[PDB]
RNA sequence: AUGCCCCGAAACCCCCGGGCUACACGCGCGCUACAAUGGGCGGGACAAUGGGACCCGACCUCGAAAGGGGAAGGGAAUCCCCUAAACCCGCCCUCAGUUCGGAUCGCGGGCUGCAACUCGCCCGCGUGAAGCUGGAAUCCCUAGUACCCGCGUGUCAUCAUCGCGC
């Protein structure tokens, strides 16, 4: 009864792996991170501003 | 497509658009001579960066500039007699091919209605539709006052062509009548200094008021 | 014939036949086109030549469109509630059908019933600033 | 005849050029015809994100781009040549895929 | 002779040889292309070159990319360059320059990117 | 009498589920074809028992997507509108319409003095 | 001479008037009542529009070689207005072009390469280039420059 | 990350019905409708950013159709999304709240998901709102730029008329 139902679709299925929010999860080739968390890991991922 | 191919092959001997070479056409008033580009060119379209040139617009052909005015005339702050002018349905904006075809029909109409070189009649209309004095506000000791001021020739061209285009929009809007026939009327009425034409009438309005504000 | 009556309503002869039937509440553009093609006549001809035999041909296509080669999806109310047969309602027939549906929805107390009662939208339209 | 198609991919251009030079030197020292390194279309992964951490503020956005570059080396088949591409010192970011084509 | 032409995105590749005067755009005759204005633009350099060289050489041009206007302008560039390279004549080049400065130069203009804040309507478009 | 697509209410009772679905519009028939949930199925078991009298309980439900069939004609079911189980009695004209359209969840919105 | 040396409009008109005679190509009984495309707003006006479709579709098989139904739908698609929402580009109908392709396939003019598309038989090429060289003769007379 | 305070079967957690979409209304921003440039049939010059594995899905075949059965190739200059759109013409319609325009209803089909009436869209059918150029006043761009026209994709089964960027 204390289990969360199994969802493959919708926001409740997708969660950011770092922060844990249920909101903005960019999935370009499988990142699983929130949109703002993406900035605190930008330069470790190899990304560079141009 | 035979009319199309005929108009394709006729200007093989360098004729503006299709016909009516620029040699027979002259200029009457001495001021427009170094600013109207009457050089013989097959198409009135250069895609040129004459805006970047402080005065390089003088090198653009007159019909090209006329289309340049015609294609940007819809939707603005002017309500002449309380009307809103705008190209809601297939706007000429960015559709210079539509403008090309429409002013092509305009040349045809002026041919079949006057029987002369269209460029000559266009010269007549622009020469007779140019206002020659205007009003300017000058303040001294906080004392704003109006002043009669002479106009530069290039601005006279700009305003004349703008009257032509704005007249075409004005008559063609909200009528069963079609754009080309209207442009033909504005040109022919200005070329004979017909005051019913908006171009000549507003040339007269701008010349007046400035006439009295001395 | 400048004035032509078909199926209890009047049409003008100037407009073409597909456009002429458009004045029938119970015939549209596509419907007029396909019935006049079922008739074998171009819908483009002017409605001033509508002869009586062709008029009753159009009438009996309105009466029983499905038997005239028309498919069942081109009618306004396919699979009618009280019969289960696809038919095309004309004039007061449409009006009574929609009246019956309104009363039926009110009777069952559906959401659409109360929306129709209040003159309110049905399909999830938002009333905060529009309307 | 048989050819080996070697696809090298990396982010830093210098590592890819290093491995290309090593492969070219090895192919020439082994005396094997090698089709030179063909630089394939670099893939540009572009991501846009609003810089505002909250719903308050002017809408400012930032675009970041990965330029992942790739090269193709078509060499002729030679076992002595194929024994000297598994011993090469490969930088970590460089990925190499070596397939065979009739 | 092989010649190149670039306008915005369209690219014109032209091959000029001796022949009856058969000029073909992507394999199609120049006289049948439905846009008449594009036909004018394509025909301008060989209008100005002369009937003699028009009939003397054969030019096959393939145009790819851009729009029809870009294709036509790139084709115009390609015919101009092909004619001047085939003849190697200075007077034709100077007449071409006098007609317009791009016939051997071209347009170095390219499109700008769409900046943020309602990027949809163009680069320099912002909200109200 | 009452009819639905040319069949009287008895003619609706005797027909099987396949054709009973055939006489429904696209949405309700497609929902039937794609199956029912097990809460829905057990609620159908309970209402079958109540129709046969074994289930004496006042019947309550929360499934707002339950398409009412002819077999539900003639019983009072209480659907959860948002606070409690508001009651509704199923009529012969009720066939072919979801239960959820019959529990008023959103309330009447009238206008007071503007501020 | 070939289709490539002649305008598309005139050539499709010639193929349409020529194929109107052939009995294997015919508009089905549901053709006069169903518009040529989903995106279309009104019904077709002329009653020859079916044969034109055929006259065009075979020309497509003359140019692209293998053709299927979905790509034909995307090509024949167009812009439809969505009321308050903006105009959108939509695909055309599929059954009409599928029937036209089947009628042509029974006509022997086109054939099916399963798993690659519909290609054009040599006989279809002969008929198309015969019409095209007919038109090229006519336009050579009208326009001598086409001799080049 | 966290100063401080507060609840501890709760100020905890889980499950579900509804709400977050509710209206006499005020305001902002985008989308479209306010035609003869025009709506409809047919031909043709055309890209491009990127994406695709329960996916791109070409393609055979059936069904109007949304789609179903089979199916090649593809984990990226290899296959697909693939068509751009703007445009012109051979032809039709003839200045009208209409052949504009589709909101608004009801019908019957399609996709998704446990399920969409609160709470998706589309496919076709009778139906056709207001709108036919809008005051004081009013915001912003200035050369591949304004104007104007569309493609694609992010997030994502669907939802955005949005943002992005081509």
Swiss-Prot record, chain B:
Keyword Repressor (UniProt): no
One of the record's GO cellular component terms: small ribosomal subunit
One MF annotation (Gene Ontology) recorded for this entry: structural constituent of ribosome
Keywords annotated in UniProt: Ribonucleoprotein, Ribosomal protein, RNA-binding, rRNA-binding
GO terms for biological process, alphabetical: translation
InterPro entries named in the record: Ribosomal_uS7 (IPR000235), Ribosomal_uS7_arc (IPR026018), Ribosomal_uS7_dom (IPR023798), Ribosomal_uS7_dom_sf (IPR036823), Ribosomal_uS7_euk/arc (IPR005716)
Keyword Ribonucleoprotein included in the entry's annotation: yes
UniProt-listed HAMAP family: Ribosomal_uS7_A (MF_00480_A)
Family: Belongs to the universal ribosomal protein uS7 family.
Subunit-level organization: Part of the 30S ribosomal subunit.
Function: One of the primary rRNA binding proteins, it binds directly to 16S rRNA where it nucleates assembly of the head domain of the 30S subunit. Is located at the subunit interface close to the decoding center.
Protein's name in the database: Small ribosomal subunit protein uS7
Source species of the chain: Pyrococcus furiosus (strain ATCC 43587 / DSM 3638 / JCM 8422 / Vc1)
Gene behind this protein: rps7
Curated annotation (Swiss-Prot), chain C:
GO cellular component: cytosol; small ribosomal subunit
BP-aspect Gene Ontology terms: translation
UniProt keywords, alphabetically: Ribonucleoprotein, Ribosomal protein, RNA-binding, rRNA-binding
Single GO MF descriptor: structural constituent of ribosome
Record's keyword annotation contains rRNA-binding: yes
A Pfam family of this chain: Ribosomal_S13
InterPro entries, sorted: Rbsml_uS13_C, Ribosomal_uS13, Ribosomal_uS13-like_H2TH, Ribosomal_uS13_archaeal, Ribosomal_uS13_CS
Taxonomic superkingdom: Archaea
Parts of the chain that traverse the membrane: none
Disulphide bridges: none
Protein biosynthesis among keywords: no
Similarity comment text for this entry: Belongs to the universal ribosomal protein uS13 family.
Subunit structure: Part of the 30S ribosomal subunit. Forms a loose heterodimer with protein S19. Forms two bridges to the 50S subunit in the 70S ribosome.
General function of this protein: Located at the top of the head of the 30S subunit, it contacts several helices of the 16S rRNA. In the 70S ribosome it contacts the 23S rRNA (bridge B1a) and protein L5 of the 50S subunit (bridge B1b), connecting the 2 subunits; these bridges are implicated in subunit movement.
The name this protein goes by in its record: Small ribosomal subunit protein uS13
Curated annotation (Swiss-Prot), chain D:
UniProt-recorded Gene Ontology molecular function terms: structural constituent of ribosome; tRNA binding
GO biological process per UniProt: translation
InterPro entries from the UniProt entry: Ribosomal_uS10, Ribosomal_uS10_CS, Ribosomal_uS10_dom, Ribosomal_uS10_dom_sf, Ribosomal_uS10_euk/arc
Any single Gene Ontology cellular-component annotation: small ribosomal subunit
Gene3D superfamilies with a match to the protein in the record: Ribosomal protein S10 domain (3.30.70.600)
Keyword field: Ribonucleoprotein, Ribosomal protein
Domain of life: Archaea
Region (Disordered): 33-59
Biological role stated in the UniProt entry: Involved in the binding of tRNA to the ribosomes.
Sequence similarity: Belongs to the universal ribosomal protein uS10 family.
Subunit structure: Part of the 30S ribosomal subunit.
Protein name per the record: Small ribosomal subunit protein uS10
Name of encoding gene: rps10
UniProtKB/Swiss-Prot annotation, chain E:
The keyword NADP is annotated on this UniProt entry: no
Pfam families in the record: Ribosomal_S9
Domain of life of the source: Archaea
GO biological process entries: maturation of SSU-rRNA from tricistronic rRNA transcript (SSU-rRNA, 5.8S rRNA, LSU-rRNA); translation
Gene3D superfamilies, sorted: 3.30.230.10
SUPFAM superfamilies given in the database record: Ribosomal protein S5 domain 2-like (SSF54211)
Annotated S-S bridges: none
Biased composition regions of type Basic and acidic residues, renumbered to the chain: 104-115
UniProtKB keywords: Ribonucleoprotein, Ribosomal protein
Name of the protein in question: Small ribosomal subunit protein uS9
Organism: Pyrococcus furiosus (strain ATCC 43587 / DSM 3638 / JCM 8422 / Vc1)
The encoding gene: rps9
């Amino acid at each position: 009864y204390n289990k969360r139902k199994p969802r493959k679709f919708g926001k409740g299925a997708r969660r950011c792996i770092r922060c844990g929010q249920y909101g903005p999860i960019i999935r370009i080739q499988g990142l699983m991170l929130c949109r703002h968390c993406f900035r605190e890991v930008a330069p470790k991922l190899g990304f560079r501003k141009y | 497509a035979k009319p199309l191919n005929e108009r394709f092959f006729i200007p093989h001997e360098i004729k503006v658009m299709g016909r009516w070479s620029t040699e027979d056409v002259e200029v009457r008033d001495p001021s427009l001579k170094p600013y109207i580009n009457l050089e013989p060119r097959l198409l009135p379209h250069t895609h040129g960066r004459h805006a970047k040139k402080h005065f390089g617009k003088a090198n653009v052909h007159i019909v090209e500039r006329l289309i340049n005015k015609i294609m940007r005339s819809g939707g603005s702050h002017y309500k002449v007699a309380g009307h809103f002018m705008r190209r809601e349905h297939r706007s000429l904006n960015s559709k210079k091919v539509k403008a090309y075809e429409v002013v092509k029909e305009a040349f045809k109409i002026i041919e079949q209605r006057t029987g002369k070189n269209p460029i000559q009649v266009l010269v007549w209309a622009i020469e007779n539709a140019a206002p020659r004095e205007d009003t300017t506000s000058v303040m001294f000791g906080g004392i704003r006052y109006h002043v009669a001021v002479d106009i530069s020739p290039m601005r006279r061209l700009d305003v004349a062509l703008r009257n032509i285009a704005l007249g075409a929009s004005a008559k063609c809007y909200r009528n069963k009548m079609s754009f080309a026939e209207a442009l033909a009327e504005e040109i022919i009425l200005a070329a004979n200094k017909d005051p019913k034409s908006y171009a000549y009438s507003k040339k007269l309005e701008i010349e007046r008021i400035a006439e009295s504000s001395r | 014939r400048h004035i032509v009556r078909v199926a209890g309503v009047d049409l003008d002869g100037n407009k073409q036949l597909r456009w002429a039937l458009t004045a029938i509440k119970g015939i549209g553009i596509n419907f007029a086109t396909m019935v006049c093609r079922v008739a074998g006549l171009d819908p483009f001809m002017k409605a001033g030549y509508l002869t009586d035999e062709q008029v009753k041909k159009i009438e009996e296509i309105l009466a029983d469109p499905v038997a005239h080669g028309i498919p069942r999806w081109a009618v306004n109310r396919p699979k009618d509630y009280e019969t289960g047969r696809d038919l095309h309602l004309i004039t007061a027939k449409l009006d009574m059908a929609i009246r019956e549906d309104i009363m039926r929805l009110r009777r069952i107390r559906a959401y659409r019933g109360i929306r129709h009662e209040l003159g309110l939208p049905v399909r999830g339209q938002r009333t905060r600033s529009n309307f | 005849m048989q050819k080996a198609r070697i696809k090298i991919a990396s982010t830093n251009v210098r590592s890819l050029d290093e491995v290309a030079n090593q492969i070219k030197q090895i192919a020439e020292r082994t005396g094997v015809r090698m089709s030179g390194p063909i630089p394939l279309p670099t893939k540009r992964i572009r991501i846009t994100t609003r810089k505002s951490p909250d719903g308050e503020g002017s809408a400012t956005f930032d675009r970041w781009e990965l330029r992942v570059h790739k090269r193709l080396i078509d060499i002729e088949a030679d076992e002595r040549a194929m024994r000297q591409i598994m011993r090469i010192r490969v930088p970590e970011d460089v990925t190499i895929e070596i397939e065979l084509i009739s | 002779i092989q010649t190149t032409g670039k306008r915005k995105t369209a690219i014109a590749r032209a091959v000029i040889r001796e022949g009856k005067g058969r000029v073909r755009i992507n394999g199609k005759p120049v006289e049948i292309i439905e846009p008449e204005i594009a036909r004018f633009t394509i025909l301008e350099p060989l209008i100005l070159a002369g009937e003699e060289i028009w009939n003397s050489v054969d030019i096959d041009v393939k145009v790819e990319g851009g729009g029809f206007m870009g294709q036509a302008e790139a084709a115009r560039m390609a015919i101009a360059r092909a004619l001047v390279e085939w003849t190697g004549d200075m007077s034709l080049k100077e007449k071409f320059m006098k007609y317009d400065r791009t016939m051997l130069v071209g347009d170095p203009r390219r499109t700008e990117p769409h900046k943020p804040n309602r990027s949809t309507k163009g680069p320099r478009a912002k909200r109200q | 009498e009452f009819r639905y697509r040319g069949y009287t209410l008895e003619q609706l009772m005797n027909m099987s589920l396949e054709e009973l679905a055939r006489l429904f519009p696209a949405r309700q028939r497609r929902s039937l074809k794609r199956g029912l949930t097990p809460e829905q199925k057990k609620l159908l078991r309970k209402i079958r028992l109540a129709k046969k009298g074994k289930y004496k309980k006042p019947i309550r439900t929360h499934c707002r997507d339950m398409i009412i069939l002819p077999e539900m004609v003639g019983l009072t079911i209480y659907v959860h509108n948002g606070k409690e189980f508001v009651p509704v009695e199923i009529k012969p004209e009720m066939i072919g319409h979801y239960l959820g359209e019959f529990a008023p969840t959103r309330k009447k919105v009238e206008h007071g003095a503007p501020g | 001479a070939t289709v490539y040396d002649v305008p598309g409009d005139l050539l499709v008109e010639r193929v349409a008037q020529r194929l109107k005679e052939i009995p294997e190509i015919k508009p089905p009984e549901w053709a006069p009542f169903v518009k040529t495309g989903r995106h279309k707003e009104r019904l077709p006006e002329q009653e020859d529009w079916w044969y034109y479709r055929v006259a065009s579709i075979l020309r497509r098989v003359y140019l692209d070689g293998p053709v299927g139904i979905e790509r034909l739908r995307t090509y024949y698609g167009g812009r439809k207005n969505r009321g308050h929402a903006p105009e959108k580009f939509y695909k055309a109908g599929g059954s009409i072009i599928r029937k036209a392709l089947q009628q042509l396939e029974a006509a022997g003019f086109v054939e099916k390469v399963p798993g690659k598309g519909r290609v054009i038989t040599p006989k279809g090429r002969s008929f198309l280039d015969k019409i095209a060289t007919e038109l090229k003769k006519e336009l050579e007379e009208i326009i001598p420059e086409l001799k080049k």
